[PDB]
Design an enzyme around this catalytic site. Structure first.
Site, PDB file in Angstrom:
ATOM      1  N   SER A  57       2.624  -7.139  11.584  1.00  0.00           N
ATOM      2  CA  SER A  57       2.050  -6.751  10.291  1.00  0.00           C
ATOM      3  C   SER A  57       0.325  -7.249  10.480  1.00  0.00           C
ATOM      4  O   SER A  57       0.109  -8.064  11.161  1.00  0.00           O
ATOM      5  CB  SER A  57       2.711  -7.396   9.604  1.00  0.00           C
ATOM      6  OG  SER A  57       3.705  -6.352   9.120  1.00  0.00           O
ATOM      7  N   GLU A  86       7.166  17.262 -12.936  1.00  0.00           N
ATOM      8  CA  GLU A  86       7.460  16.005 -12.422  1.00  0.00           C
ATOM      9  C   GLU A  86       5.985  15.184 -12.052  1.00  0.00           C
ATOM     10  O   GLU A  86       4.867  15.939 -11.960  1.00  0.00           O
ATOM     11  CB  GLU A  86       8.238  15.682 -11.440  1.00  0.00           C
ATOM     12  CG  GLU A  86       9.705  15.840 -11.751  1.00  0.00           C
ATOM     13  CD  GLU A  86      10.519  15.528 -12.977  1.00  0.00           C
ATOM     14  OE1 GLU A  86      10.034  14.077 -13.728  1.00  0.00           O
ATOM     15  OE2 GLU A  86      11.073  15.625 -14.162  1.00  0.00           O
ATOM     16  N   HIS A 102       6.686  -2.813  15.418  1.00  0.00           N
ATOM     17  CA  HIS A 102       7.488  -4.069  16.202  1.00  0.00           C
ATOM     18  C   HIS A 102       5.918  -4.667  17.781  1.00  0.00           C
ATOM     19  O   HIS A 102       5.784  -5.359  17.941  1.00  0.00           O
ATOM     20  CB  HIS A 102       8.501  -3.264  16.728  1.00  0.00           C
ATOM     21  CG  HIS A 102       8.816  -4.872  17.918  1.00  0.00           C
ATOM     22  ND1 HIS A 102       8.870  -5.000  18.904  1.00  0.00           N
ATOM     23  CD2 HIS A 102       9.877  -5.676  17.623  1.00  0.00           C
ATOM     24  CE1 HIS A 102       9.720  -6.414  19.408  1.00  0.00           C
ATOM     25  NE2 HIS A 102      10.405  -6.199  18.429  1.00  0.00           N
ATOM     26  N   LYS A 162      12.307 -14.377  -0.226  1.00  0.00           N
ATOM     27  CA  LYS A 162      10.908 -14.180  -1.148  1.00  0.00           C
ATOM     28  C   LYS A 162      10.658 -12.422  -1.347  1.00  0.00           C
ATOM     29  O   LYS A 162      10.591 -12.265  -1.715  1.00  0.00           O
ATOM     30  CB  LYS A 162       9.693 -14.782   0.226  1.00  0.00           C
ATOM     31  CG  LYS A 162       8.675 -14.105  -0.896  1.00  0.00           C
ATOM     32  CD  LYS A 162       7.028 -14.072  -0.180  1.00  0.00           C
ATOM     33  CE  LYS A 162       5.895 -13.355  -0.034  1.00  0.00           C
ATOM     34  NZ  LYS A 162       4.971 -14.307  -0.940  1.00  0.00           N
ATOM     35  N   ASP A 163      11.315 -12.005  -0.095  1.00  0.00           N
ATOM     36  CA  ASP A 163      12.848 -10.396  -0.729  1.00  0.00           C
ATOM     37  C   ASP A 163      13.505 -10.493  -2.081  1.00  0.00           C
ATOM     38  O   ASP A 163      13.349  -9.322  -2.356  1.00  0.00           O
ATOM     39  CB  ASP A 163      12.689 -10.093   0.886  1.00  0.00           C
ATOM     40  CG  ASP A 163      11.113  -9.494   1.255  1.00  0.00           C
ATOM     41  OD1 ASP A 163      10.494  -8.395   0.302  1.00  0.00           O
ATOM     42  OD2 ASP A 163      11.740  -9.315   2.590  1.00  0.00           O
TER      43      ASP A 163
HETATM   44  C1  HEM Z   1       9.027   6.019   2.641  1.00  0.00           C
HETATM   45  C2  HEM Z   1       9.521   5.397   3.720  1.00  0.00           C
HETATM   46  C3  HEM Z   1       8.862   3.932   4.199  1.00  0.00           C
HETATM   47  C4  HEM Z   1       9.268   2.712   4.417  1.00  0.00           C
HETATM   48  C5  HEM Z   1      11.352   2.398   4.646  1.00  0.00           C
HETATM   49  C6  HEM Z   1       8.729   1.711   5.127  1.00  0.00           C
HETATM   50  C7  HEM Z   1       8.686   0.496   5.926  1.00  0.00           C
HETATM   51  C8  HEM Z   1       7.915  -0.735   6.504  1.00  0.00           C
HETATM   52  C9  HEM Z   1       8.098  -1.735   6.714  1.00  0.00           C
HETATM   53  C10 HEM Z   1       9.330  -2.313   6.106  1.00  0.00           C
HETATM   54  C11 HEM Z   1       6.746  -2.032   6.708  1.00  0.00           C
HETATM   55  C12 HEM Z   1       6.470  -2.974   6.826  1.00  0.00           C
HETATM   56  C13 HEM Z   1       6.529  -4.109   5.654  1.00  0.00           C
HETATM   57  C14 HEM Z   1       4.995  -4.193   4.851  1.00  0.00           C
HETATM   58  O1  HEM Z   1       4.061  -4.017   5.068  1.00  0.00           O
HETATM   59  O2  HEM Z   1       5.526  -3.413   3.452  1.00  0.00           O
HETATM   60  C15 HEM Z   1       6.068  -1.304   6.780  1.00  0.00           C
HETATM   61  C16 HEM Z   1       4.774  -1.463   6.410  1.00  0.00           C
HETATM   62  C17 HEM Z   1       3.648   0.303   7.005  1.00  0.00           C
HETATM   63  N1  HEM Z   1       3.919   1.029   6.030  1.00  0.00           N
HETATM   64 FE1  HEM Z   1       5.884   1.810   5.607  1.00  0.00          FE
HETATM   65  N2  HEM Z   1       7.200   2.414   4.582  1.00  0.00           N
HETATM   66  C18 HEM Z   1       7.439   3.726   4.335  1.00  0.00           C
HETATM   67  C19 HEM Z   1       6.449   4.864   4.057  1.00  0.00           C
HETATM   68  C20 HEM Z   1       5.340   4.716   4.319  1.00  0.00           C
HETATM   69  C21 HEM Z   1       4.172   5.439   4.566  1.00  0.00           C
HETATM   70  C22 HEM Z   1       4.777   6.598   3.663  1.00  0.00           C
HETATM   71  C23 HEM Z   1       3.074   4.572   5.065  1.00  0.00           C
HETATM   72  C24 HEM Z   1       1.575   5.449   5.457  1.00  0.00           C
HETATM   73  C25 HEM Z   1       1.619   7.044   4.365  1.00  0.00           C
HETATM   74  C26 HEM Z   1       3.222   3.932   5.674  1.00  0.00           C
HETATM   75  C27 HEM Z   1       2.162   3.506   6.456  1.00  0.00           C
HETATM   76  C28 HEM Z   1       2.577   2.013   6.438  1.00  0.00           C
HETATM   77  C29 HEM Z   1       1.378   1.201   7.212  1.00  0.00           C
HETATM   78  C30 HEM Z   1      -0.351   1.349   7.675  1.00  0.00           C
HETATM   79  C31 HEM Z   1       2.324  -0.426   6.910  1.00  0.00           C
HETATM   80  C32 HEM Z   1       1.158  -1.587   8.519  1.00  0.00           C
HETATM   81  C33 HEM Z   1       0.387  -2.344   7.031  1.00  0.00           C
HETATM   82  C34 HEM Z   1       0.428  -3.619   7.514  1.00  0.00           C
HETATM   83  O3  HEM Z   1       1.027  -4.671   8.768  1.00  0.00           O
HETATM   84  O4  HEM Z   1      -0.536  -4.602   7.347  1.00  0.00           O
HETATM   85  N3  HEM Z   1       4.803   3.551   5.344  1.00  0.00           N
HETATM   86  N4  HEM Z   1       6.317   0.072   6.322  1.00  0.00           N
HETATM   87  C1  LIG Z   2      10.143  17.872  -8.836  1.00  0.00           C
HETATM   88  O1  LIG Z   2      10.722  19.499  -8.863  1.00  0.00           O
HETATM   89  C2  LIG Z   2      10.072  20.025  -9.229  1.00  0.00           C
HETATM   90  O2  LIG Z   2       8.395  19.332 -10.235  1.00  0.00           O
HETATM   91  N1  LIG Z   2       8.868  21.315  -9.775  1.00  0.00           N
HETATM   92  O3  LIG Z   2       9.924  22.279  -8.226  1.00  0.00           O
HETATM   93  C3  LIG Z   2      10.690  23.155  -9.285  1.00  0.00           C
HETATM   94  C4  LIG Z   2       8.548  22.063  -9.678  1.00  0.00           C
HETATM   95  C5  LIG Z   2       9.023  22.396 -11.618  1.00  0.00           C
HETATM   96  C6  LIG Z   2       7.668  22.728 -12.942  1.00  0.00           C
HETATM   97  C7  LIG Z   2       6.897  23.419 -12.069  1.00  0.00           C
HETATM   98  C8  LIG Z   2       5.938  23.254 -10.622  1.00  0.00           C
HETATM   99  C9  LIG Z   2       7.219  22.928  -9.571  1.00  0.00           C
HETATM  100  C10 LIG Z   2       6.732  22.447  -8.454  1.00  0.00           C
HETATM  101  O4  LIG Z   2       5.462  21.688  -8.267  1.00  0.00           O
HETATM  102  C11 LIG Z   2       5.020  21.318  -7.064  1.00  0.00           C
HETATM  103  C12 LIG Z   2       4.102  20.718  -6.286  1.00  0.00           C
HETATM  104  C13 LIG Z   2       3.733  21.098  -5.235  1.00  0.00           C
HETATM  105  N2  LIG Z   2       4.817  21.578  -4.720  1.00  0.00           N
HETATM  106  C14 LIG Z   2       4.857  21.618  -3.068  1.00  0.00           C
HETATM  107  C15 LIG Z   2       6.120  21.447  -2.706  1.00  0.00           C
HETATM  108  C16 LIG Z   2       7.303  21.718  -1.751  1.00  0.00           C
HETATM  109  C17 LIG Z   2       5.852  21.423  -0.915  1.00  0.00           C
HETATM  110 CL1  LIG Z   2       6.324  21.410   1.193  1.00  0.00          CL
HETATM  111  C18 LIG Z   2       4.716  20.855  -1.068  1.00  0.00           C
HETATM  112  C19 LIG Z   2       4.242  20.441  -2.269  1.00  0.00           C
HETATM  113  N3  LIG Z   2       5.583  21.167  -5.816  1.00  0.00           N
END
Ligand code: HEM
Ligand SMILES: COC(=O)N(OC)c1ccccc1COc1ccn(-c2ccc(Cl)cc2)n1
Ligand SMILES: CCCCCCCCCCCCCCCCCC(=O)OC[C@H](COP(=O)(O)OCCN)OC(=O)CCCCCCCCCCCCC
Ligand code: HEM
Ligand code: HEM
Ligand code: HEM
Ligand SMILES: COc1c(O)c(C)c(C/C=C(/C)CC/C=C(\C)CC/C=C(/C)CC/C=C(/C)CC/C=C(\C)CCC=C(C)C)c(O)c1OC
Ligand SMILES: CCCCCCCCCCCCCCC(=O)OCCCOP(=O)(O)OC[C@@H](O)COP(=O)(O)OCCCOC(C)=O
Ligand SMILES: CCCCCCCCCCCCCCC(=O)O[C@H](COC(=O)CCCCCCCCCCCC)COP(=O)(O)O
Ligand SMILES: CCCCCCCCCCCCCCCCCC(=O)O[C@H](COC(=O)CCCCCC)COP(=O)(O)OCCN
Ligand SMILES: COC(=O)N(OC)c1ccccc1COc1ccn(-c2ccc(Cl)cc2)n1
Lengths: 54, 93, 61, 248, 385, 126, 62, 110, 93, 50
Positions: free
Chosen positions: H41, H107, H37, H63-64
């Site tokens: 973006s 997995e 915010h 659009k979403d």
């Molecule tokens: C897992 C739950 C997450 C939620 C609910 C979430 C939600 C959002 C939303 C709604 C936006 C604005 C819309 C968009 O840019 O698509 C956003 C932007 C962004 N997110 Fe996430 N996000 C999540 C995870 C992550 C992760 C894992 C990363 C990076 C490692 C990340 C990095 C960013 C960045 C850098 C932006 C800004 C992009 C831009 O403005 O160009 N977010 N996020």
């Molecule tokens: C979805 O569950 C599986 O696939 N599990 O777990 C029962 C599985 C099953 C069979 C063989 C190996 C695994 C585990 O493979 C991995 C590889 C990395 N992580 C890990 C876990 C915790 C944290 Cl903090 C960071 C990294 N785990």
């Protein structure tokens, strides 16, 4: 004077806060345990175990 | 963001009260005065003064509800004695 | 006959009573053989299950 | 309710473990287990107490290993799937007399005797009620009360009639330490053993609470000091007003 | 500017904890809200460490709690802290609410803050009820039976609601496994309502014991009211420790150390001490449907107070008649708890009826009439002709 | 809350009546002395809650000299209360000084809000 | 410690126990039989080790 | 572990923690949105967007919806018509410490 | 509350860009035009134009990594046949 | 047993298949074990006991 070695500093202040915390716990533990085990003398298992000597 | 609907309170500098003029404030540092100075002349003067004011508003209600619990508990124990079995079969019906 | 005293949840004892039927030590909840309160302050006699008959069958349900 | 349907109030006896700095008397626990084994265990279970928890409290390790081996426990099946047995070990639990609830009621005229692992905590009165019950059976019931056949009177039980009969009498147990085994003496040691069965953390809990209450009591006094020092400027601050000229 | 004012996340800490303007005259009755926040942290942390050792199956439940007591290292500390921590949480909340009733904090401009609080109270009774059932002793089984069978009186739809709540035809295994999963959830909903509660306080800030404006003399929060709050934190942790370590079962019932049995009813089914006044209100209504309505109406009549106080002054500090009837209402709330722990017998039947009336007449008949009388007395004492 | 127009209507009726004034005025005087706001150095109009538009209007129309004194009485009372003391008896508000200095500004702002509101929901004849 | 004792599992018996929830192999011996084990030299194998390092009193194996 | 191997104390503590961590992720998602915010973006060109802006409602809300319904459709096709293709068959065998599988495989996403 | 450290984006009216002068914008209502108007002349003109640009940046990498997985999978299957047991005992040591 | 009704066999057929097996009943008035025939809420038994 005293201020510049104990109080003024903020590393052997927060330092000696935890230094005494580690030392306070061990002496405080040993002292309370000794008072409790002495106030209840004759009822403990160690004293009974020695008293049933047959 | 945008500004929202405003309040009856602000912040430092614009707290939102009336303009003040002609008031002067004085104070002394705590390091320059002696703490724990008068706390008798406190528990014996002020606590007893504060008690004496707000104690007839708390104790007249307490006396009415405690008397009520009494006369009920006394009467119940009479009902379930053997001298009060005739009254029990009258009131329980 | 089901034993859910509505205002107790109490459990009348067999092998006791006044008429060879029922007594509970609950309130003096005496029932009759058929199971109708008789001398205890409980308001009503209790629910008989909607069990039917179909032959090698009594569908207690 | 009347007083009979409620029960008679238990008195206040002077137990040696009542007090914030007191422990259990461990010689009374040891004697109490002997009363359990020779009087109570015929018809009461102790399912929640394991053998190992007696070591260091009332008996020696070598003593407890020999008590457990006098009972047989179900082993896992053999190479052909037939069941086996084995003697007891320290990780086993103290066994009860009956195998199911039906056999227990059959041997006690329909009534079921309860497990005693938590009976001190599961009754209003605690140890004073357990002691007063066992020592409260009168000679005759009071004139007028009609007991069923197979019930016994003592006034500490709610209702007045209990399925247990008096089981304690003088000199039925010979104590190893030479204590006179009167009725009250055995009742006291039984109740002390049973309280340990319900509360096996009693002695540790009461000394960790001495540490915690001393530390927190001084922090509370130190906090009052520090507050009053940091608030002394505000409490003695003074104000003066000089009315300005309303020119403005 | 300073980093604590420029950073996105620390700016919120500074505005709520450090530089927040507070009235100079607030007393120690304003410290209860801090304690309720430590209470919620105690319960959530102690509960998660016990959930690692708990089993919710109806055949395994009672014995899992006895296994936490005997075999888990320091498990007797976790349970007794947790069990007695809920009794303390409820006592600080009743005092927090009674304060706001005395000092007029419900009035405009703070009507929204009072309403989010009434929601927290409802969700907190629900949480505690669900947790007591998970012990599954003898007060656990028969307490859930009495309350869940109340919903079978709703017209034409009731017997469908009880069987969907139970998962069957009685309080059984499906009931105990669903009540534990919901009991873990609702604490996280209470926390989200506590954040919305604080947002509504930041708009107008706090009131003060005199009932007038506080914008002419303000003190920051840090190092006047932070150190004033340590005083009551350590007194709370001292008294709680005295119950956990020296008297840990006085605020309970012995029957809940008997395991739960559907075939043997206890001689007295009694709730915990903090739900007894509401339990006496229910028992006072002869009809089943009207009883369950009157009990929930006892919680939601608090929302009517911002419109029934007809006074031009905020608070009771300068009000003589309104002080007497504030303390009538407090001790009538203590008698309802006592009567809720008694047998249904003469004269405790009529006593609870008259006292259920006085609970409702305070909010609806007494406050409007004394507030109007007090306004007119202030006028004719000054303006006399 | 109740309007000061309604408070004044009831009060004036009580005061013009001889029997009611001889019966309700002594009760009102000792209700004032038992309240105890003079002992902190306040007049009654200092106590009226100010978080509403009719009352914000009345405080702007107040003269400057009366407004500076009101601010000082309110600061002095907050300081007296955090120390848990009372003021000296020679600094207590006397009865002849406890005047309704703000009531005329309130009744004027209320009468204008009612006239404006009636005019916004009028039923017209033809 | 699920510690078995000595006269339990006989000649033709190599029972797998759940000691400490571990798949543990226990075997029975006869005194002719650790020459049995070190019948070989070690350069055939990875890490030079001996009966005396295998199991202390090797005539009952775990 | 709570012991000397993967056992009962391990499985009961892993379920209580598995319920918890989703509520911590939700609190980090709120802090994530607060940091967006401030500057808003970005855009696919990599230059400022302060010269031409559109409000969110009824251009980007609708659009979403387009991608919400495509997500639900493809997910429904896996749940109802191919519900075990993104798994391993060995996890329908109950857990046994005494028999090791021939291939221990996670997995697809780890 | 107080104001915090400011940004590179504002709000409506003070968005924080440069001052504009001399630009005119025109538009027509959507109710007054026809939707779904040209979406061929879209999937055949523009999608094929957008594909033709950004496809040598995605497919030359994909071709290098897939060839690599191939020659490894081919060689492994040879090692564990009977014609490749001599090589297995060479490379596995 | 019940899950076969309406899928491969009739209700009357499945009641007769289940009654050809013996299941553990709860103990009698003196605590000795009993047996009984199968019913629809029972599960299909296996050949071996362990
Ligand atoms: C897992 C739950 C997450 C939620 C609910 C979430 C939600 C959002 C939303 C709604 C936006 C604005 C819309 C968009 O840019 O698509 C956003 C932007 C962004 N997110 Fe996430 N996000 C999540 C995870 C992550 C992760 C894992 C990363 C990076 C490692 C990340 C990095 C960013 C960045 C850098 C932006 C800004 C992009 C831009 O403005 O160009 N977010 N996020
Ligand atoms: C979805 O569950 C599986 O696939 N599990 O777990 C029962 C599985 C099953 C069979 C063989 C190996 C695994 C585990 O493979 C991995 C590889 C990395 N992580 C890990 C876990 C915790 C944290 Cl903090 C960071 C990294 N785990
Ligand atoms: C839906 C459910 C809602 C129902 C909720 C019902 C709430 C009942 C809960 C009872 C809580 C205990 C009462 C708390 C009272 C708070 C009152 C308060 O805020 O303080 C008032 C007063 C301060 O005095 P002043 O500010 O007027 O200053 C004096 C002149 N300068 O200071 C005082 O005078 C306080 C004196 C202490 C009164 C003691 C009575 C406590 C009663 C015992 C209750 C518990 C017994 C088991
Ligand atoms: C020192 C010896 C014993 C002790 C301390 C003991 C303990 C207890 C206790 C504490 C109760 C409490 C139940 C209650 O009042 O709520 C009880 C009940 C009972 N006891 Fe014992 N017991 C002993 C010996 C025996 C023996 C030897 C028998 C059988 C021969 C027996 C049979 C019963 C029965 C049948 C009850 C059930 C009472 C009822 O429900 O009416 N007891 N016992
Ligand atoms: C507002 C917060 C909470 C309140 C007021 C509350 C209340 C209670 C109460 C009154 C009991 C019964 C106490 C007794 O044993 O007599 C209980 C039991 C229990 N609660 Fe909570 N609870 C809260 C949060 C939690 C959370 C978040 C969890 C799980 C993570 C939890 C887990 C448990 C468990 C496992 C029991 C089992 C019985 C016991 O250990 O005492 N509680 N709870
Ligand atoms: C988990 C439960 C709660 C928490 C953590 C909480 C927290 C707080 C805090 C920190 C304050 C700051 C000022 C003060 O301490 O008085 C406050 C004020 C307040 N709370 Fe709560 N509260 C809770 C429940 C409630 C309930 C149940 C009510 C009413 C039904 C309520 C109504 C109020 C009101 C009216 C104020 C403002 C009082 C004033 O400014 O004079 N709160 N709360
Ligand atoms: C008048 O103005 C005031 C004011 O006076 C005060 C006192 C406060 C402070 C008072 C408060 C009540 C705020 C405190 C916040 C809360 C009570 C919300 C708590 C929310 C939670 C989600 C608590 C959960 C806590 C946890 C520790 C969850 C994580 C659990 C763990 C780490 C245990 C399990 C972990 C393992 C590894 C087993 C104000 O904010 C305030 O506003 C300006
Ligand atoms: C019309 C079309 C709609 C269709 C789409 C449907 C979607 C509907 C739901 C939309 C999602 C909700 C909107 C998002 C939102 O309000 O929150 C996300 C933004 C970040 O939350 P925040 O309120 O700034 O944080 C909350 C903060 O602003 C408040 O901070 P506070 O917690 O009060 O401070 C207390 C901290 C004190 O510190 C401590 C605890 O010591
Ligand atoms: C949040 C609402 C208020 C509730 C009470 C808050 C309690 C938790 C905060 C504790 C106060 C810490 C502030 C100290 C400070 O920063 O000033 C520090 C003091 O730090 C020190 O060196 C002395 C050690 C601090 C004593 C800690 C006492 C108890 C700690 C927690 C107890 C468990 C709950 C001085 O710097 P300052 O004057 O600029 O603030
Ligand atoms: C109401 C619910 C949710 C909102 C919670 C608000 C209250 C949470 C208190 C958070 C405690 C402080 C967190 C870290 C403060 C320092 C952040 C920082 O320095 O920003 C960044 C570092 O980036 C990070 O790594 C953020 C890690 C976040 C840690 C997650 C706990 C650098 O600082 P920055 O330049 O952005 O600050 C602007 C002021 N000039
Ligand atoms: C702490 O747990 C107990 O005391 N429980 O519950 C097992 C108990 C135990 C014995 C007897 C009665 C109860 C219940 O008493 C009450 C009275 C009112 N509620 C209630 C419940 C939910 C909602 Cl939303 C609103 C009101 N419950």
């Amino acid at each position: 004077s005293l201020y510049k070695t104990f109080f003024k500093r903020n590393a052997v202040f927060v330092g000696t806060i935890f230094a005494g915390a580690f030392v306070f716990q061990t002496v405080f533990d040993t002292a309370i345990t000794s008072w409790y085990e002495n106030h209840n003398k004759g009822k403990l298992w160690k004293d009974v175990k020695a008293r049933i000597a047959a | 963001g945008p500004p929202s609907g405003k309040t009856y309170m602000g912040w430092w500098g614009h707290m939102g009260g009336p303009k003040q003029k002609g008031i002067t404030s004085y104070a002394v540092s705590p390091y320059a005065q002696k703490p724990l100075q008068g706390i008798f002349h406190n528990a014996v003067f002020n606590s007893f003064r504060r008690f004496k004011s707000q104690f007839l508003y708390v104790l007249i209600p307490a006396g009415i509800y405690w008397y009520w619990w009494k006369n009920g508990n006394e009467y119940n124990e009479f009902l379930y004695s053997k001298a009060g079995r005739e009254e029990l079969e009258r009131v329980n019906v | 006959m089901l034993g859910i005293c509505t205002h107790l949840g109490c459990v009348p004892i067999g092998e006791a009573g006044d008429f060879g039927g029922w007594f509970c030590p609950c309130h003096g909840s005496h029932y009759d053989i058929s199971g109708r309160i008789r001398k205890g302050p409980a308001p009503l006699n209790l629910e008989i299950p909607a069990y039917e008959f179909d032959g090698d069958k009594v569908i207690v349900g | 309710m009347t007083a009979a349907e409620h029960g008679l109030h238990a008195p206040a006896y002077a137990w040696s473990h009542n007090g914030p700095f007191e422990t259990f008397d461990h010689a009374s626990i040891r004697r109490g287990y002997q009363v359990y084994r020779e009087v109570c265990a015929a018809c009461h279970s102790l399912d929640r107490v394991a053998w190992r928890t007696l070591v260091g409290v009332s008996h020696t390790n070598e003593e407890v290993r020999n008590m457990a081996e006098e009972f047989e426990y179900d082993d896992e099946p053999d190479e052909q799937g037939n069941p086996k047995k084995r003697p007891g070990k320290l990780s086993d639990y103290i066994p009860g007399p009956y195998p199911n609830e039906q056999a227990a009621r059959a041997a006690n005229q329909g009534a079921l005797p309860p497990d005693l692992s938590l009976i001190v905590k599961a009754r209003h009165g605690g140890c004073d009620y357990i002691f007063s019950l066992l020592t409260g059976y009168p000679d005759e019931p009071p004139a007028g009360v009609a007991l069923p056949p197979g019930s016994n009177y003592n006034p500490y039980f709610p209702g007045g009639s209990i399925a247990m009969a008096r089981v304690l009498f003088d000199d039925m147990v010979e104590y190893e330490d030479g204590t006179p085994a009167t009725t009250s003496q055995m009742a006291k040691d039984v109740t002390t053993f049973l309280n340990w069965c319900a509360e096996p953390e009693h002695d540790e809990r009461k000394r960790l609470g001495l540490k915690t209450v001393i530390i927190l009591s001084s922090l509370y006094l130190l906090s009052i000091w520090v507050k009053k020092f940091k608030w002394a400027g505000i409490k003695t601050r003074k104000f003066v007003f000089n009315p300005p000229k309303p020119r403005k | 500017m300073a980093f604590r004012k420029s950073n996105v996340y620390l700016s919120l800490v500074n505005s709520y904890i450090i530089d927040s303007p507070q009235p100079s005259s607030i007393n120690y009755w304003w410290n209860m809200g801090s304690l309720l926040g430590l209470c919620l942290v105690i319960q959530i942390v102690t509960g998660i460490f016990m959930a690692m050792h708990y089993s919710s199956n109806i055949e395994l439940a009672f014995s899992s709690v006895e296994h936490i007591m005997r075999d888990v290292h320091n498990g007797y500390i976790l349970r007794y802290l947790h069990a007695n921590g809920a009794s303390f949480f409820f006592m600080v909340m009743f005092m927090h609410m009674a304060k706001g009733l005395y000092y007029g904090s419900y009035r405009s401009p703070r009507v929204t803050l009072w309403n989010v609080g009434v929601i927290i109270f409802i969700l907190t009774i629900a949480t505690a009820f669900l947790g007591y059932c998970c012990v599954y002793g003898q007060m656990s089984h028969w307490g859930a039976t009495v309350i869940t069978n109340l919903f079978s009186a709703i017209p034409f739809v009731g017997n469908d609601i009880v069987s969907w709540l139970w998962g069957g035809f009685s309080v059984s295994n499906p009931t105990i496994q669903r009540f534990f999963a919901l009991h873990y959830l609702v604490p996280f909903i209470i926390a989200a309502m506590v954040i919305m509660h604080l947002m509504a306080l930041h708009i107008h800030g706090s009131s003060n014991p005199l009932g007038i404006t506080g914008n002419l003399d303000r003190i920051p929060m840090h190092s006047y009211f932070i150190f004033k709050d340590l005083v009551t934190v350590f007194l709370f942790m001292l008294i709680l420790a005295l119950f956990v370590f020296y008297s840990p079962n006085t605020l309970g019932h012995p029957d809940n150390y008997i395991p739960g049995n559907p075939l043997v009813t206890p001689a007295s089914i009694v709730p915990e001490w903090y739900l007894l006044p509401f339990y006496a209100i229910l028992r006072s209504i002869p009809d089943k449907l009207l009883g369950v309505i009157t009990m929930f109406a006892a919680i939601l009549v608090l929302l009517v107070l911002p419109f029934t106080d007809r006074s031009v002054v905020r608070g009771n500090t300068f009000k003589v008649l309104s002080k007497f009837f504030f303390f009538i209402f407090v001790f009538n709330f203590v008698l309802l708890g006592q009567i809720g722990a008694c047998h249904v017998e003469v004269p405790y039947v009529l006593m609870g009826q008259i006292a259920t009336f006085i609970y409702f007449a305070y909010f609806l008949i007494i406050v409007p009439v004394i507030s109007t009388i007090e306004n007119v007395l202030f006028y004719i004492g000054r303006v006399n002709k | 809350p109740q309007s000061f127009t309604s408070i004044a209507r009831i009060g004036d009726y009580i005061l013009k009546s001889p029997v009611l004034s001889k019966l309700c005025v002594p009760v009102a005087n000792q209700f004032i002395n038992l309240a105890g706001y003079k002992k902190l150095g306040l007049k009654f109009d200092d106590l009226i809650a100010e978080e509403n538009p009719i009352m914000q209007t009345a405080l702007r129309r107040l003269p400057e000299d009366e407004s500076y004194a009101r601010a000082y009485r309110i600061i002095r009372a907050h300081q007296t209360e955090l120390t848990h003391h009372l003021l000296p008896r020679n600094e207590w508000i006397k009865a002849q000084e406890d005047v309704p200095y703000l009531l005329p500004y309130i009744l004027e702002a209320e009468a204008a809000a009612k006239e404006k509101d009636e005019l916004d929901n009028i039923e017209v004849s033809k | 410690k699920v510690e078995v004792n000595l006269a339990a599992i006989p000649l033709g018996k190599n029972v797998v126990v759940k000691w400490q929830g571990k798949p543990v192999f226990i075997r029975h011996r006869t005194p002719h039989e650790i020459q049995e084990a070190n019948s070989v030299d070690m350069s055939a194998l990875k890490d030079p080790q001996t009966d005396a390092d295998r199991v202390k009193d090797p005539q009952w194996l775990i």
